[PDB]
Write an enzyme that holds these catalytic residues in place. Structure first.
Site, PDB file in Angstrom:
ATOM      1  N   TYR A  95      15.286  -0.729  15.216  1.00  0.00           N
ATOM      2  CA  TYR A  95      15.611  -1.003  13.849  1.00  0.00           C
ATOM      3  C   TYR A  95      15.248  -2.475  13.478  1.00  0.00           C
ATOM      4  O   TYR A  95      14.740  -2.880  12.491  1.00  0.00           O
ATOM      5  CB  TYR A  95      17.047  -0.556  13.339  1.00  0.00           C
ATOM      6  CG  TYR A  95      17.205  -0.769  11.888  1.00  0.00           C
ATOM      7  CD1 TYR A  95      16.876   0.444  11.167  1.00  0.00           C
ATOM      8  CD2 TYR A  95      17.830  -1.516  11.213  1.00  0.00           C
ATOM      9  CE1 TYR A  95      17.024   0.509   9.817  1.00  0.00           C
ATOM     10  CE2 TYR A  95      17.944  -1.475   9.949  1.00  0.00           C
ATOM     11  CZ  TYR A  95      17.524  -0.454   9.157  1.00  0.00           C
ATOM     12  OH  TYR A  95      17.636  -0.440   7.729  1.00  0.00           O
ATOM     13  N   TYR A  96      15.633  -3.508  14.654  1.00  0.00           N
ATOM     14  CA  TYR A  96      15.509  -4.907  14.453  1.00  0.00           C
ATOM     15  C   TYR A  96      14.289  -5.107  15.322  1.00  0.00           C
ATOM     16  O   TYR A  96      13.748  -4.509  16.162  1.00  0.00           O
ATOM     17  CB  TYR A  96      16.657  -5.497  15.144  1.00  0.00           C
ATOM     18  CG  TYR A  96      18.076  -4.943  14.075  1.00  0.00           C
ATOM     19  CD1 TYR A  96      18.371  -6.141  13.389  1.00  0.00           C
ATOM     20  CD2 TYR A  96      18.565  -3.984  14.422  1.00  0.00           C
ATOM     21  CE1 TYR A  96      19.409  -5.786  12.665  1.00  0.00           C
ATOM     22  CE2 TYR A  96      20.000  -3.875  13.671  1.00  0.00           C
ATOM     23  CZ  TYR A  96      20.055  -4.903  12.638  1.00  0.00           C
ATOM     24  OH  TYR A  96      21.393  -4.727  12.030  1.00  0.00           O
ATOM     25  N   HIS A 101      14.530   1.439  28.137  1.00  0.00           N
ATOM     26  CA  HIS A 101      15.397   0.497  28.462  1.00  0.00           C
ATOM     27  C   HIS A 101      15.549   0.134  29.842  1.00  0.00           C
ATOM     28  O   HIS A 101      15.827   1.209  30.396  1.00  0.00           O
ATOM     29  CB  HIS A 101      16.614   0.760  27.517  1.00  0.00           C
ATOM     30  CG  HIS A 101      16.579   0.326  26.007  1.00  0.00           C
ATOM     31  ND1 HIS A 101      17.412   0.668  25.256  1.00  0.00           N
ATOM     32  CD2 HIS A 101      15.553  -0.068  25.388  1.00  0.00           C
ATOM     33  CE1 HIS A 101      17.211   0.299  24.059  1.00  0.00           C
ATOM     34  NE2 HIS A 101      15.893   0.216  24.090  1.00  0.00           N
ATOM     35  N   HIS A 159      16.721   4.328  31.421  1.00  0.00           N
ATOM     36  CA  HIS A 159      16.492   5.517  30.153  1.00  0.00           C
ATOM     37  C   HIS A 159      15.550   5.131  29.381  1.00  0.00           C
ATOM     38  O   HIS A 159      15.123   4.041  29.031  1.00  0.00           O
ATOM     39  CB  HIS A 159      18.044   5.651  29.739  1.00  0.00           C
ATOM     40  CG  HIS A 159      18.633   4.484  28.921  1.00  0.00           C
ATOM     41  ND1 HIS A 159      19.130   3.587  29.557  1.00  0.00           N
ATOM     42  CD2 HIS A 159      18.543   4.284  27.694  1.00  0.00           C
ATOM     43  CE1 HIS A 159      19.208   2.496  28.630  1.00  0.00           C
ATOM     44  NE2 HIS A 159      18.883   2.849  27.466  1.00  0.00           N
ATOM     45  N   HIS A 216      14.663   6.030  25.221  1.00  0.00           N
ATOM     46  CA  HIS A 216      15.134   6.555  23.766  1.00  0.00           C
ATOM     47  C   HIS A 216      13.881   7.246  23.213  1.00  0.00           C
ATOM     48  O   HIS A 216      12.988   6.588  22.902  1.00  0.00           O
ATOM     49  CB  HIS A 216      15.603   5.492  22.781  1.00  0.00           C
ATOM     50  CG  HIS A 216      16.822   4.791  23.325  1.00  0.00           C
ATOM     51  ND1 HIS A 216      17.996   5.130  22.936  1.00  0.00           N
ATOM     52  CD2 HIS A 216      16.998   3.855  24.126  1.00  0.00           C
ATOM     53  CE1 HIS A 216      18.917   4.327  23.551  1.00  0.00           C
ATOM     54  NE2 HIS A 216      18.204   3.593  24.288  1.00  0.00           N
TER      55      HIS A 216
END
Ligand SMILES: [Cl-]
Ligand SMILES: [Cl-]
Ligand SMILES: [Cl-]
Ligand SMILES: [Mg+2]
Ligand code: NA
Ligand code: NI
Length: 226
Positions: free
Chosen positions: A21-22, A150, A161, A163
């Site tokens: 998002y950022y 990440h 992991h 996403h």
């Protein structure tokens, strides 16, 4: 995280929590010239998306902006209840993560991403859209997926992991982009987690690593690093 596979439905209510998002204003990409991010899925390819994920484009697709003239209508009621997509977060076993992040083993990282990619390919088999011919459900076999790796390389509980953010969209036979009918995806969490697990083990075994299997839970970790 702790779960082998977590699936988080992203809506307007929780969108600021979504990975990606950022971003930093000076950069077009989160991670240019690396494989921390990638576009995956046959739908991504249909959109001409490959390689590093451009942050602006990720954010457009999140809210259904296919292009400036084409904004998806995925609403049937409250506007804040619109589903924006699904974060399928695949987390590696602890010993696997330690080998990747503490010992800096790039083979492990590659195996993990191949495993995520295999699970994404399985997820694609579950893609569906509603059509009108009388309501008819079409198997579309295409997803648009932005993946973010990440690497939590802390000495205390290393966590590798990825996403895999599945956009709430799929391209229909008529070329039209429509919301995913998530029923099949949702009921296949255990199956997809096991695709990732089995594929990770297969890749590590092919690369020559010794694994330790837990027969009770039917899981595995590195033989000496668990
Ligand atoms: Cl994300
Ligand atoms: Cl693969
Ligand atoms: Cl749905
Ligand atoms: Mg990635
Ligand atoms: Na573990
Ligand atoms: Ni994360």
């Amino acid at each position: 995280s702790n779960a082998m596979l977590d699936i988080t439905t992203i809506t307007r209510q929780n969108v600021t929590s979504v990975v990606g998002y950022y971003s930093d204003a000076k950069d077009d990409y989160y991670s240019k010239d690396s494989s921390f991010t990638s576009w995956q899925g046959t739908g991504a390819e249909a959109l001409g998306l490959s390689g590093d994920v451009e942050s602006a484009r990720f954010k457009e697709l999140l809210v259904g902006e296919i292009d400036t003239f084409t904004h998806m209508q995925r609403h049937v009621g409250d506007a804040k209840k619109e589903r924006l997509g699904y974060d399928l977060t695949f987390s590696a076993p602890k010993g696997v993560s330690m080998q990747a992040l503490i010992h800096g083993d790039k083979t492990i990282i590659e195996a993990h991403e191949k495993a995520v990619a295999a699970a994404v390919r399985e997820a694609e088999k579950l893609a569906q859209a509603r059509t009108t011919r009388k309501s008819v459900t079409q198997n579309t076999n295409n997803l648009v997926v932005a993946t973010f790796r990440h690497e939590t390389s802390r000495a205390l509980d290393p966590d590798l992991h990825t996403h895999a953010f599945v956009m709430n969209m799929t391209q229909r036979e008529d070329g039209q982009w429509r919301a995913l009918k998530n029923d099949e995806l949702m009921r296949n969490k255990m199956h997809l987690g096991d695709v990732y697990k089995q594929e990770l083990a297969l890749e590590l075994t092919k690369a020559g690593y010794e694994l330790r299997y837990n027969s009770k839970n039917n899981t595995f970790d590195m033989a000496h690093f668990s």
